[PDB]
Structures are given as C-alpha cells and as structure tokens.
Amino acid sequence: LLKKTTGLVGLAVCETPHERLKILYTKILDVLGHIPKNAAYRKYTEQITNEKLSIVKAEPDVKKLEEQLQGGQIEEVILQAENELSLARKMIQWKPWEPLVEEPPASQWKWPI
Amino acid sequence: TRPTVRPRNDVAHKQLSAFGEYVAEILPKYVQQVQVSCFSELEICIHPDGVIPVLTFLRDHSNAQFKSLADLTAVDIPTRQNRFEIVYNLLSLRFNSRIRVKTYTDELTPVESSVSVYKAANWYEREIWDMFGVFFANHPDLRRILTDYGFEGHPFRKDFPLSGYVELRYDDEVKRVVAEPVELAQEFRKFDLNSPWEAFPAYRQPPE
Amino acid sequence: TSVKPIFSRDMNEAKRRVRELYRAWYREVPNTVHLFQLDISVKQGRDKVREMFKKNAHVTDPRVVDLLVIKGKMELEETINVWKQRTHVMRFFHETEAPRPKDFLSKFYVGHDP
Amino acid sequence: TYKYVNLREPSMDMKSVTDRAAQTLLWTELIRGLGMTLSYLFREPATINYPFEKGPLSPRFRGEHALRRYPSGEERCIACKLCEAVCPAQAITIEAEPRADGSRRTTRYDIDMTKCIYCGFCQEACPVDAIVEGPNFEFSTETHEELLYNKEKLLNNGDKWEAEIAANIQADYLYR
Amino acid sequence: PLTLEGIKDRVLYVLKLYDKIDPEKLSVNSHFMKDLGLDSLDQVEIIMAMEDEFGFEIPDIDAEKLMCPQEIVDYIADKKDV
Amino acid sequence: ASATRLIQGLRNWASGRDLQAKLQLRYQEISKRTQPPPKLPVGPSHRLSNNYYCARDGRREAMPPSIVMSSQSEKKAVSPAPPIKRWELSQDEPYL
Ligand code: SF4
Numbered sequence A: 001l002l003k004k005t006t007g008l009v010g011l012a013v014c015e016t017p018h019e020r021l022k023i024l025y026t027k028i029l030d031v032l033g034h035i036p037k038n039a040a041y042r043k044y045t046e047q048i049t050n051e052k053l054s055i056v057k058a059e060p061d062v063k064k065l066e067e068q069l070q071g072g073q074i075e076e077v078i079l080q081a082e083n084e085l086s087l088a089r090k091m092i093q094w095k096p097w098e099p100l101v102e103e104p105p106a107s108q109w110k111w112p113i
Numbered sequence B: 001t002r003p004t005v006r007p008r009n010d011v012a013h014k015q016l017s018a019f020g021e022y023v024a025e026i027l028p029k030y031v032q033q034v035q036v037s038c039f040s041e042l043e044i045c046i047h048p049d050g051v052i053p054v055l056t057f058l059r060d061h062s063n064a065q066f067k068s069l070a071d072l073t074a075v076d077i078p079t080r081q082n083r084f085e086i087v088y089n090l091l092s093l094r095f096n097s098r099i100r101v102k103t104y105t106d107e108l109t110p111v112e113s114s115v116s117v118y119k120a121a122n123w124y125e126r127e128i129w130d131m132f133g134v135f136f137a138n139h140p141d142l143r144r145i146l147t148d149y150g151f152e153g154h155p156f157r158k159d160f161p162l163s164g165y166v167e168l169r170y171d172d173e174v175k176r177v178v179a180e181p182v183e184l185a186q187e188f189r190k191f192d193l194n195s196p197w198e199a200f201p202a203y204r205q206p207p208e
Numbered sequence C: 001t002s003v004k005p006i007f008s009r010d011m012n013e014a015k016r017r018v019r020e021l022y023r024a025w026y027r028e029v030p031n032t033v034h035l036f037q038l039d040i041s042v043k044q045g046r047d048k049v050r051e052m053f054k055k056n057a058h059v060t061d062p063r064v065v066d067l068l069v070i071k072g073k074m075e076l077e078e079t080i081n082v083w084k085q086r087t088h089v090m091r092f093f094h095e096t097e098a099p100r101p102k103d104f105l106s107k108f109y110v111g112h113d114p
Numbered sequence D: 001t002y003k004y005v006n007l008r009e010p011s012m013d014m015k016s017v018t019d020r021a022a023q024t025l026l027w028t029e030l031i032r033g034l035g036m037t038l039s040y041l042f043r044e045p046a047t048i049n050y051p052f053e054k055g056p057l058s059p060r061f062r063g064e065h066a067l068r069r070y071p072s073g074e075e076r077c078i079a080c081k082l083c084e085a086v087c088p089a090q091a092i093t094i095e096a097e098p099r100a101d102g103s104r105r106t107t108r109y110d111i112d113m114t115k116c117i118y119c120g121f122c123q124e125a126c127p128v129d130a131i132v133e134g135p136n137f138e139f140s141t142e143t144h145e146e147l148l149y150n151k152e153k154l155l156n157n158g159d160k161w162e163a164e165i166a167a168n169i170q171a172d173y174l175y176r
Numbered sequence E: 001p002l003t004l005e006g007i008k009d010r011v012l013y014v015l016k017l018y019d020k021i022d023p024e025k026l027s028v029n030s031h032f033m034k035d036l037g038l039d040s041l042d043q044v045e046i047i048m049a050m051e052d053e054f055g056f057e058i059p060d061i062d063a064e065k066l067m068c069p070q071e072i073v074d075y076i077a078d079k080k081d082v
Numbered sequence F: 001a002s003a004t005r006l007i008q009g010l011r012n013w014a015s016g017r018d019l020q021a022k023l024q025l026r027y028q029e030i031s032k033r034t035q036p037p038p039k040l041p042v043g044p045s046h047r048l049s050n051n052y053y054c055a056r057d058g059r060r061e062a063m064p065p066s067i068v069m070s071s072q073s074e075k076k077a078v079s080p081a082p083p084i085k086r087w088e089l090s091q092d093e094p095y096l
C-alpha cells in the first residue's frame, strides 16, 4: 500500500516489515537459547515470541496483521522486538533467576507503623 | 452500599494480581513483596540492589511496556532502620496500566541511579537528594534543586522542624541580606487532634 | 556489620579525598575574594576554611566523611560558578548576630537557656 | 475520537499555487490581520470608570472579616474556637473567660489579615454565624500593623457593615 | 633547578615565608609533625606552597611521604634532572 | 449596540463576520442579579426507615491490601490488562 507516514515523530516507515520481524524474532529465540530452561522468564517470553512469530509467519498482509497483532503500527512492533532483544541480552548479563539475595527487616513493609 | 460507597473493580483486581504473580515469578532475585490494594493498585516492593534490572524489565518486556515514568518519591519513616522508602510510579500506555515499585535505603547507603532507564528521573531523584540526603550513585549531575545555595540540612526529613534554623532579613550596616537564627513572633500552635477511640477495626494491629 | 561503601573502602581513600578537597578550597579562596568584591582578606577566608575543616574533624565512618566530601564539593562548584551571591559567601561569617555568652554567669544573667 | 490537526496536503495545480504565490507576494494574510485590528478599533471598549463604577459581585463574596450581633445587641460569638481550629493559615487567635453575667464570651479575638488566605472556612464553621466575610475589599492600609485586627476592630466592622451583611446572608443562606 | 644547594635554599626560603612555623627550631632535618608541631593541613599548604613556587604539580600520594625538608629537596631533585 | 449602521457595516466588512449577532459586551439578556428563593433537594439517605448506617458505611468496607506474594506448570503469560483499542478517526471533523 506504501504507507506515507506512521504518524509518530521520529519513527520512520519500514519498507519490508515481515522479513524484519522474522529476523528479530529468530534473533530473540537464538539469544534466549542461552538462558537456563527452568527460568520462568525464558519460558514466558519464548511463548509470546513464538506466538508472535506464528502470527507474522501465517499472514501475507500488513494492515490486518497490524490489527490482529494488537501492537499499533508495525513499526512500533519492530521497535518492541528490538527492545525485547536488548532486554534478553541484559537478562543474560544480570541472571535474575537466582534466589533472593537478602531478606528485608522484620517490619520493613509494615504499614501503618 | 449503592449510593455513597465506591464500587469495586474485581476484573482489574484479578488482572493486577495475575500480573504481580507473573513479575514475582520472572524476577525472584530482587522482588520481596507483591500486594494489590482494595482500590486496585499494584505495589511491588523489591530489594534496592535490583532497582536497575527490574525497572528495565518493566521498560522493555513485551507484556509490560511501562514506558512512562510518572513520578519518583521518597518517604521518611523514622521508626525503621531503613528510614527512606523510594517509590517509582510507572505508566504503561500500551496496556493502559500503572505500577508502583518500592525500595528501602537509610541515610548512608547509596542508590543506583535510574537515569539510564528513564531520563526524567535525572531531575526527580535529584530533588530527592535536595529533600532527603539520599545519595544516588552514577548520577550525571547531582546537586540541590529547590533549597537555597547556603542551605544546611534536608528539610523533608521528619526530624527537621517546620520553620528552619535560619531566616533572612536585610541589614543596613553591612548593606546585605543576612541570615539569623529564627525567632517567630507567633509560635506555631501544635494541635493534638487524634481521637482516643479506634476508627477502623479492619486495620487493627495485633498486640504485644 | 557489612555495608555498601559510597566511594572509599577504608579511611585512607577518604582522607585522600579530604586532602584534595582542602587543596581545591585553598586554591579557590583568593579567586572568591577578588571576584565577589568581599571586604575580607585571603587570610580570613583560608582561616574560615580551616575552621570548618577542623570543626568537622571528629568523624571515623568512611561513608559519613564520603558524604561530607561530596557536600563540600557541591559547595565548591556553587562557588566556582557565580551562583552564590555576596550574601551566600558571607553566610559563613556571622557578622550581624551578637556574640553568645559562654560562661555560666552571663547565661544566668541573660535568661533561662542552659 | 481524534482529529489530525496540520495534516493537510495542499493542491499542486496551477490555480492554487498561483494563489499561494500571490499570497506571499502581495501579503494577503497581513492585510487580514490589519483588517481584524481595524475592525476591533471601532468597537466600544469594555473599560469601566473606576471608582465611579464597580465590577459585578455576588452575595457569596469573601472580603473583609466582621463579627456580627444578635438583633438585641448581644454579640453572637460564644467562644467555641471552631474558627481558629479550622483556620488553615492559623490567622485566628482566641482567648476567652466568663464575664460578669456568667456568659461564655471572648476576651481576645485577633485575626491576622496578612496571614489569612480569605478562604471562608471560619464563616462556614461558625455555628451561630458570628464571624463573617463581608463584601468590603477597598481596605488597603499604609502600615503593616494596621492589618492586625483585634476584637474591637472586628466589632466596629460588624457594626459598620451589618446593613449589607444581613442582606447578603438572607439572600445566600438557603444554599448552605 | 640547577644545583641541589639551590633547591635546598629555595625550599628553606619557602619554609621561611610560612608563618605558623617558628624560625628558631627550623632546620634541614626538622620533622613537621613530631618536631615542629604542625597538623596535616599545614603540611598540605606547605606542599602547595612548593607547587606554587617551583611551578610544577605534586600529586597527593607522592606528597604524603615528604614530611621534612630533606625528602622535599630529594623529591624535587628526583622529578627534575639537576 | 449603540454604534451607527455605517460603523457597523465597516466593522462587519473589516472583521469578516457579522459582529452584531455575537456581541462580547453583555446586555439585558443576562440573568437578574436577584433571584427567587430556592428549595434544595435532599439526598438518598434522608429517610426514616431502612436507613441503618452499618449497611451504607463506605469507610468501614476498606480492607488492608491483599498480599499476592511474600517472603514471610504451563501457565500462559499474562499482561496487566488487555491491549488498548485503536482510536477511531472522528466522523465529525477529521481535519483530512
Ligand atoms: S477565611 Fe480562611 S484563612 Fe481567613 S481567617 Fe477564615 S478560616 Fe482563616
């Protein structure tokens, strides 16, 4: 359809969204392959990324792909995929699936005092 | 309970409880408590050392997308050893939701600054310093933002009096605006307004 | 009793930072006197800086002296740039107020304050 | 439920582009602004002749404070200290003692008119309509201490402005 | 910066302009703390007096070992050719 | 409204509108400064029977915040809410 503008300032319109989204989702899965399986974060974001990849793979169109992905325009979907990739790399760096590092004091979260 | 009582939102309560369990399951290294209030507000109380990852998760996970930092607050409760409670309010425009993240520090422990996650905090937590003395490590430009330049002490601490310790007046001998110890013409009348009868039985604390 | 440090692991690095801050203030004082057109001398300002440094010289916790060095650095940057006026620089020199009594007898004469 | 302000594609045909070129070569919109100002010159200005004319006011107006009386000479205030307890700026100072006939009356009623934010909480917390905010607003002084009203000044203000305060209360009290 | 006696008399000279040190007990091998009776900040301003007069910068971890005029003149001799 | 017809025509021509229909200065069309006395209605709790306060007390129905997790399978991933609906363009004046 060659959409003229996305309506968002500073967010350019992507010529080919399908191949870009497939590349981002495959990169996300490749990155998540390093997280241990028993971590709940890997399972949850693997499930949602697999769902979004199935939708973006079984859909030739763009407008109703946007309307059924429920993520606004396709360009902000691509932006969120890149953000999820960066988050997955940082999650690998941080390792937050480990147990709690410190108990709080006895009356730390008691309200009212 | 129809006309004068605020109606409940049970579906929002269920959704917020489910998302709180989701967040507390994804990040067990840092979160310590997850609660939902009676008016459907989600509070996630976490360890201070996870103030950088958790927010980043809420900024970047596809199921959270809390892209907006609405507010940043410090609360002073002197009865705790970690007397300062630091509160982040996040708004997610994609899912139309709000979340609250609370950490705890005392006067001497520094905090990792959340400028790299949210840029607005670059002023907000700076104000916290100017009001509380909570040091934020790795801040780009940390200084006072509201008090006077020669101001000593942090005013929003609960051990700081309402009127300060100094006050300004013009002196013609030195031709200058000078500071002198405060002497009020009228003392601030303190009112003891608390009734000695218990009002809310649901919030009654167990005895000792 | 294990705590998160601010900048210094022990007292030696904290004393090093104190030394740097005192060096910077001692270098700054003549520029403050000349730029603000104060009526004080360089000796008076340097003696005032030494007075605050010796007044605040009984601490032994690395985090406390770290925060004190931080606040002194903030005051130094507020003086390096022209953000303070003449009044804010002269806040340290309490000239307008009368000198308070020190011995028992004068405090007994003036009022009930211990 | 939303509209697109400034998303108009101008026409590229010769007529519209010549109209635009004539607009930026002959200053059409500047003439439009000149015509707007010239038309606004010949209208009657909305300037009133103060102090010979006054702006319109409602009987709910909160101006200078006053202490009222009963229609027998007895003052209405019975020293209940609700106004000084509800005053947000702590402008009211009340000291009371029983007088010679044993009534509960005030001995000191000061209102600091430089502290008062003119919010009308005192006149709405009074159970006997003793303290009121009158309609007077032209009471600027030349000295700071003249704005420190005691009981005598407020009683004089009440006796001065009763003939208007009573009418305002009569016109307004059904909404309270 | 030419001869060691030149640096020695310059160091002694800048010691002479310092006011809180008595001229009586000052010698070449006079200690700042336990002999001349000075604080740490007095040694600090002595060190930046040396920095001002000699015109070269001295870092703090070097300046904490210069506790009498002998290591001061040795330190100026070391960092220059002489 | 006291202007002559020539001045009115000049104002209408230079402004571009008909200014006599919409005059900013107020006139006799406004409400009277004195009004008849009102009779205000009462609320729903102004009743003599079946009006016990324990059955309509909103403050006493507030509970403490329920704790979801505390430190003392194949469940689907969730969201704080269903995703927001796309805004529809205005049919009144879309400015397009
Ligand atoms: S109007 Fe408000 S601020 Fe003024 S005296 Fe009354 S209660 Fe106080």
Ligand code: SF4
Pocket (backbone or CB within 6 Å): D076, D077, D078, D079, D080, D081, D082, D083, D084, D094, D122, D125, D126, D127, D128, D129, D130, D131
């Ligand atoms: S509220 Fe009224 S009656 Fe009570 S002390 Fe004030 S003026 Fe007097």
